[PDB]
């Protein structure tokens with residue numbers, strides 16, 4: 001497949017450098033430099049339980065890409081014990097070949113949150129990376145609320 005081959009070259013050239021989350025406030029809730037976008041292994045992350053109380057969270061996401069992309073975008077789903085509770089769409093747009101970029105997103109909560117003690121270890125965030133319609137990778141991060 002010509003498309004399959006293109007997705008793999010994009011994946012091969014892609015790196016998530018660092019990321020953080022802030023209350024939208026302005027206060028840093030979490031930050032890391034693990035590439036949570038790597039597919040095929042379940043990532044784990046520890047986040048402050050207070051995040052469950054925020055109406056909105058601001059994410060900063062720094063990434064590099066050898067390959068040019070025309071419409072880089074994400075689809076993210078929150079799963080609780082295997083059931084999708086919420087889905088988010090974010091678009092970055094055009095990506096220059098061999099660039100490093102910082103991408104700011106606003107994540108809003110829809111609905112009433114279960115307590116942290118119930119959620120912890122039972123939430124998975126599934127992320128799909130797209131160039132327009134081309135699925136480049138799928139990764140998963142299990143959340144613990146501390």
Ligand SMILES: CC(C)Sc1nnnn1-c1ccccc1
Nearest residue numbers: 030036037045047059125127141
């Ligand atoms: C690979 C995706 C970018 S993971 C992701 N997307 N928004 N928040 N978030 C995250 C941030 C810290 C811990 C667990 C999940």
